[PDB]
DNA sequence: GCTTATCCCCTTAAGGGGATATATATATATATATCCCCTTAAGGGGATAG
DNA sequence: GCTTATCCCCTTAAGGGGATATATATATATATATCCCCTTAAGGGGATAA
């Protein structure tokens, strides 16, 4: 039977999964319905029954982890059919990362739409120490997703939203180095989410907070917000997320954020967060780590930057010297697009700046705050870490950073 | 309504008085003596497409458009 | 606010609107990136604007557009 | 879009795909008018029109190897334009499991029809580490492969419209090379047919191989070819999902009853039971329908072809947590209490009672039963001393250990 | 023409034959004498279909069956 | 080996052979999983007998058919 | 010195003329696939005789 | 001793009748994406008449 889609409890349309592979989407009446209706995912826009193109397997598909090897439990733990976008997503199908919901047409339940498992320690880490050997949570490597209430988070219940995401240890110590990156992060004006670590027992976690999921004024109601990924923009698999597949960088976006809503002080944050992952030696932003919002008619506005983390912790003292590092999407340049940390000097941003005909000034002004704030940040970040916070990514990083914020005052 | 922000974000909309005005762009530009490409074009490409010639479909449409505040 | 018909009075009206903020067309074109022969022609010639130039043009002065029943 | 299908230069048919995304097919009729033609499986046979059956789909999908491990990369590392079969195809139509060749209809070009590059002897264990962690290739099946060409002592690559010769499987377990290694050399001493399998080495890498009875050098050496074959599940027109039979697929009784049409009959049957007492003895417990295939023939005619992808599943016995208690063979078997598959606690009766079932001559299950009844404590030492010594000699101990455990039930007896 | 060994093989063709002619699965019960339906039941699953019965198809189809060694 | 057409022409021809080749009933039906009997009917009566059956005989009979023009 | 409209050079091409390869929707007919019924009978066990 | 024809016991389904549901085909209006031809020119560099 046809499984039906709802975006916070709304009619949208149900989609028409077939044998022979020829997917037909539809629009649920109720949602061309409203004025402020809202398209699934760009890529799908807004029209009339069934939908003749392919982006939309794609974005059905996109509802699954990127690493290939969390595709398998589903059809284990809970028994499924098979793999695909339609067996691996009719037991879990529930909660998408995101807002919307699929369940078949055979199933208009409402489980206590609310409730939490105050779990204790033994019971926190226990969920957890299974993560090695009805919700959705894919953006890096391997991490789950819980419900921050509080001060003692708590196992969710029926179609209950997820408040966090809780990443495990996967980068020989990663918690440590995203939660890091992210405090420093913010420290230089970048808007990206106030996460926390997480500590049970004698385990070790990375615990961030949502960005499509809030709670309203009186704290009654926690509505998902509606999201999306870059990939999902021009109906993409997530095999394309780095440019070696085929997937958008920073050239492919920059045409596009510029329909947003803040297109203005959107593409700034952009160009900035890019020299940001440069010089902190973050190489792991991808296609998949940027997303918009997906508001009423047909709006998008940059979120909160996400999944950043840098080579630095682990570089050289091992079998991977510095020369080995290569910022996750490419930039324009002279000779094709560099990609090379220390290949990719300033004067480069500026070209690669002036290629898209983005506001010269703006950019000198960026590659200016960073360099001078860039010294107090890392102390302020390193005057503010925990009483055990592993020296070694501390300085190692740190280290790295200053020398790469080198190419900077002496240019500007 | 909505705010319009891009070329494409209005393209969207132009789409509805089609299939919910029942016309379509075999008709739309039969009265305002303009070709179906630009039409059809323009649904999917409305970058290439020049305001004079937007208005003809504009009001051809039974809409027009103004400005508002991007707040 | 007002309903707009033709390319004339589309940006006839975005003019006043960066003249009563004391901005220039040269100045703007900047912050956003185009030039100011473009600005420029556009007011005296906005009637060939491509959208892209049109909504950019916006872009600038921090505007939003919308349709309106033609009634 | 239309995806034409092609047989050792030959224009077998068009595969196309509605808008909607169907997977739909229909054989050119130049096929057809042949004396020779033959379905890509028994599951879709020659016809005059678009078909629209599952199957259509079906096929295809076991094409493109089952791993969504490898999709993802295949997408990933090919520019593809979606997880589907027909997608993954439409650009890696170069090698495919069985005859098949799949190039749009812009490239009736006469591409490289031979031609390759010999591999180093570093290379060699280069290319490995690449798949693990023109090169079009594809095989279908469990963990991390790829095949390649040989001529003479060299590793050359498959380019352009050009197939391979040979299969190299990586380790999984703690081991798998070693694994399918020892399996396979046992099974030319018990009477059962296999390929020639090897285990080339490339610097840090015990690496497998093997012969792929699929492909075949003809007399002039001229031209190397594949041949149009498919295993099981394939035949009807199955996913790879219904694999297994406790998951809905063909068990030991479809099987044999569909052996019966082969146009070797009673051979496919007796190899395929006594593989089935074999793989009792040694805990092959992944017996299923994607590792028995059979060769197709002009007119529909088609025999059991040799068995592949043999492994047992002993090297985690004895000090590790899964036990022989808990291992269970791939097929299920016909006992007095429903069906029994536990192999730890399967007794020659119960066979009997199966051979008794899908009537087949008592008298020919025994003269199979019989056979293994003491061919053991030969046929052993006669693989066991044609192993080098790099060879990890502590999957000898526990396989053979266990396999005369069960051994006994045929020693007290015959 | 092409050896067979076994009870589908024989409809796979027998009905790429009747494709080949262009006729109606009709015609074909009513041209001899019998149902429509076993035409139908014989071209998909004709394994517990009568033997008479083939010929009776065979006939039909202008066509005739022949032992091969 | 000629152009058959009727039930009872292949049961006789097929006897010619499983005789003259020394071959028989009682260990026709022991090999290919039957019945004796059922060699036996359908060789005298083969007009009601099956098509799934007229093979099982073919594998025993290391024969099979075809179709001719 | 700052704001603004032309113009030169140049690449891309929207858009009108004129015209064609994909689309929902539809009716005579065609149509290979199914259903309750009904019943004569085949292979299955097991087994003796003209 | 042996190959071969019957024979009861016994489950099921094939074939007939009649009838019907699910395809599937050559039709037939009416409809979003394109294609080569060709003409005023708009939006980028760069520059400056006013």
Request: proline share 5%.
């Amino acid at each position: 039977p046809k499984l039906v889609t709802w975006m916070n409890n709304q009619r949208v349309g149900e989609l028409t999964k077939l044998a022979n592979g020829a997917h037909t989407f539809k629009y649920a009446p109720e949602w061309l319905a409203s004025r402020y209706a809202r398209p699934l995912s760009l890529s799908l826009p807004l029209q009339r029954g069934n939908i003749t193109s392919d982006a939309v397997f794609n974005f059905f598909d996109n509802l699954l982890p990127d690493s290939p090897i969390v595709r398998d439990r589903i059809v284990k733990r809970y028994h499924a059919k098979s793999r695909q976008p339609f067996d691996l997503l009719s037991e879990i199908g529930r909660d998408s990362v995101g807002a919307v919901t699929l369940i078949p047409e055979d199933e208009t339940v409402t489980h206590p739409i609310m409730a939490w498992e105050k779990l204790t320690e033994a019971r926190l880490e226990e969920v957890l120490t299974a993560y090695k050997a009805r919700i959705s949570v894919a953006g890096a490597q391997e991490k789950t997703a819980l419900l921050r209430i509080g001060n003692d988070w708590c196992i969710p219940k029926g179609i209950t939203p997820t408040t966090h995401i809780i990443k495990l240890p996967i980068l020989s110590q990663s918690v440590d180095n995203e939660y890091y990156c992210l405090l420093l992060a913010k420290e230089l004006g970048l808007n990206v989410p106030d996460a926390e670590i997480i500590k049970a027992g004698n385990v070790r976690a990375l615990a961030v907070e949502r960005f499509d999921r809030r709670w309203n004024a009186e704290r009654t109601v926690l509505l998902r917000l509606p999201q999306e990924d870059m990939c999902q923009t021009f109906g993409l698999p997530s095999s394309v997320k780095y440019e070696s597949d085929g997937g958008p960088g920073i050239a492919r976006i920059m045409a596009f954020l510029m329909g947003s809503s803040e297109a203005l002080k959107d593409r700034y944050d952009f160009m900035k967060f890019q020299v940001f992952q440069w010089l902190i030696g973050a190489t792991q932003g991808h296609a998949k780590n940027f997303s918009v919002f997906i508001q009423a008619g047909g709006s998008y506005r940059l979120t909160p930057f996400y999944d950043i983390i840098s080579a630095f912790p682990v570089l050289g003292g091992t079998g991977i010297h510095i020369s080995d590092l290569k910022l996750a999407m490419g930039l324009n340049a002279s000779k094709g697009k560099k990609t090379a940390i220390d290949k990719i000097y300033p004067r480069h941003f500026l070209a690669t700046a002036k290629v898209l005909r983005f506001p010269e000034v703006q950019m000198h002004e960026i590659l200016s705050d960073f360099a001078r704030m860039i010294p107090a940040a890392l102390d302020n970040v390193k005057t503010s870490l925990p009483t055990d916070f592993p020296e070694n990514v501390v300085t190692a990083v740190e280290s790295n950073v200053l020398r790469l914020h080198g190419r900077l005052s002496r240019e500007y | 309504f909505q705010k319009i922000y891009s070329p494409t974000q209005l393209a969207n909309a132009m789409k509805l008085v089609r299939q919910q005005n029942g016309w379509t762009q075999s008709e739309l530009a039969k009265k305002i003596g303009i070709k179906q490409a630009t039409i059809s074009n323009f649904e999917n490409n409305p970058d290439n497409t020049t305001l004079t010639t937007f208005f003809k479909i504009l009001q051809s449409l039974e809409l027009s458009m103004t400005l508002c505040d991007a707040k």
